């Protein structure tokens, strides 16, 4: 004669989507967190769930999709109120820069002049600036248009806006919780033990890059190879290193900036002359570290690919620079570095040249582009690689040897690499059970 008993506050949960919000360290005009508002606890709480086993799947993680949306929306919010550059989509007259310029930059840096209006609609001014070849398109000889004149609206990024990544902590609203795997050597697709509950995630820096990751977390103890399905060549492989690789990047030229008033108080920023000589942009990767790093990676790949098999690294297929090169942003400047000097080995201080571009159609979309204003002086940045994004070739012929190349580029992968340890669940406090009682 057991009867129904009802409880409230029962410690159970179900997989769920929720609305997430930002929290920060308080201490940190920077686009990623102008109104994050919520401070995190200086000492985040975490509860160990002993005797709990839970299922995680990083490839179906709704948190990744939400981060993607929040990043895009904030990006657009930043540019929405900034000056349009439509008046610059005019015939431009260009010659090469030959003044104490090295061979690597011949034909890359251009000196261009044009007719643009002043503050009054009745008057024009003759102005000039320097441009990089990548953003200048030839008409039919010395005449050029902006690369995206017939393609997209160009919005100038506002000055005094920082793009520097700020760790963002995602927090769940009351009624929801975030579960995390502390289980070591976890590849993100199966059950994990050592599960804990938190209210907020660790801070994640919204770093944007392509072929190689930058400033992420390191794996503990071993290199972890993660993919949805290893067998399917269409899937990308996210490799998380347990040691960083140091990379030193620079824009060696001492630049200047001009500011041209146009229209009713609007301003256009443009590259001025270069002080000193003109040199090519580049990145240094410690050589010994890089070699050792690949050996560590290969050793883990062999678990799925064979002991007597040959693992090769090679450069990527052609396509847009955000596919074929290593893209990153330092101080707000946009670099496109050649990685063929890294992925060139067979298993059984490296200098990489870089290009600079200013008109950029970020997030793989057409119709909008940002114009990145120049930064005066000399740019230097040092980063931690902490992981690679690789893809594999066919392997159907002579399946003793397989080649991996830098690849992917889908921006989602840069988040999956940090969010794979987290899951959102909802708390469901009500439940029933039989017992001995009556009213």
């Amino acid at each position: 004669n057991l009867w129904v008993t009802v409880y409230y506050g029962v410690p159970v949960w179900k997989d769920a989507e929720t609305t997430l919000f930002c929290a920060s360290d308080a201490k940190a005009h920077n686009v990623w967190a102008t109104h994050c508002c919520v401070p995190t606890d200086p000492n985040p709480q975490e509860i160990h769930l002993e005797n709990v086993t839970e299922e995680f799947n990083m490839w179906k993680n709704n948190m990744v999709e939400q981060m993607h949306t929040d990043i895009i929306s904030l990006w657009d919010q930043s540019l929405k109120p900034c000056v349009k550059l439509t008046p610059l989509c005019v015939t431009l007259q260009c010659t090469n820069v030959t003044n104490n310029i090295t061979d690597d930059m011949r034909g890359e840096l251009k000196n261009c002049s044009f007719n643009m209006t002043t503050e009054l609609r009745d008057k024009k001014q003759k102005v000039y600036s320097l441009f990089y070849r990548l953003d200048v398109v030839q008409i039919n000889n010395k005449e050029y248009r902006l690369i995206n004149c017939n393609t997209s609206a160009i919005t100038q990024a506002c000055p005094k806006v920082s793009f520097e990544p700020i760790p963002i902590h995602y927090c769940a609203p009351a009624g929801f919780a975030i579960l995390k795997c502390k289980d070591k050597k976890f590849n993100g697709t199966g059950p994990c033990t050592n599960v804990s509950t938190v209210q907020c995630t660790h801070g994640i820096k919204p770093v944007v890059s392509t072929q190689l990751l930058l400033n992420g977390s390191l794996a503990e103890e071993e290199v972890i190879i993660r993919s949805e399905n290893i067998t399917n060549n269409a899937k990308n492989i996210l490799v998380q290193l347990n040691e960083s690789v140091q990379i030193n990047c620079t824009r060696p030229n001492n630049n200047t900036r001009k500011s041209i008033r146009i229209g009713p108080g609007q301003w256009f920023y443009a590259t001025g002359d270069i002080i000193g000589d003109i040199r090519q942009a580049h990145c240094n990767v410690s050589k010994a570290t890089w070699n050792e790093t690949l050996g560590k990676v290969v050793k883990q790949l062999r678990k799925h690919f064979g002991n007597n098999t040959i693992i090769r690294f090679a450069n990527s297929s052609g396509g847009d620079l955000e596919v074929t090169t290593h893209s990153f942003n330092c101080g707000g400047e946009f670099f496109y570095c050649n990685t063929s000097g890294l992925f060139n080995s067979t298993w059984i201080s490296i200098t990489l040249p870089c290009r600079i571009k200013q008109i950029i159609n970020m997030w793989q979309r057409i119709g909008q582009a940002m114009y990145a204003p120049p930064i005066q002086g000399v740019i230097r940045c040092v980063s931690n690689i902490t992981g690679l994004i690789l893809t594999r070739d066919g392997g159907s012929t002579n399946s003793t040897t397989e080649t991996f190349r830098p690849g992917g580029g889908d921006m989602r992968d840069n988040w999956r690499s940090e969010l794979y340890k987290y899951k959102v669940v909802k708390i469901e406090p009500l439940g029933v059970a039989p017992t001995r009682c009556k009213r």
């Binding site: 005797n51 929306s73 009213r439």
Partner: protein
């Protein structure tokens, strides 16, 4: 323990954390910016789900309690398991899975039982 620390505990032992678990359900310039909107939506969502559960308890009777008892008998159909098998050597998560597809049946029965009780207290008050 703390919030959900009882997840690995047996159903019986876990009853000692009902209060803490309940306590976590409801935890100057402001412009339209993305982070601002998401926080406000998040606050609203938490409230909407909270109220749904409180009303459901009100309908069934037991308002204000963490632990209560009703007059609906337990059906062996839902689960013909012993108390020594349910209240021990089992967690609430496991239990929820075991009887997951009977949830709405139970709820309908609880609602009807309270409805009948309300009619009966109205009749007694109507006595004189």
């Amino acid at each position: 323990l703390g919030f959900l620390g009882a997840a690995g505990s047996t159903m019986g032992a876990a009853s000692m954390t009902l209060t803490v678990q309940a306590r976590n359900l409801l935890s100057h310039l402001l412009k339209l910016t993305v982070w601002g909107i998401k926080q406000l939506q998040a606050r609203v969502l938490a409230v909407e789900r909270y109220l749904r559960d409180q009303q459901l308890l009100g309908i069934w009777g037991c308002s204000g309690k963490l632990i209560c008892c009703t007059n609906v008998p337990w059906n062996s159909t839902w689960s013909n398991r012993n108390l020594s098998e349910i209240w021990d050597n089992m967690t609430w998560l496991q239990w929820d899975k075991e009887i997951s597809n009977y949830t709405q049946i139970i709820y309908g029965l609880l609602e009807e039982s309270q409805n009948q009780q309300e009619k009966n207290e109205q009749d007694l008050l109507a006595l004189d």
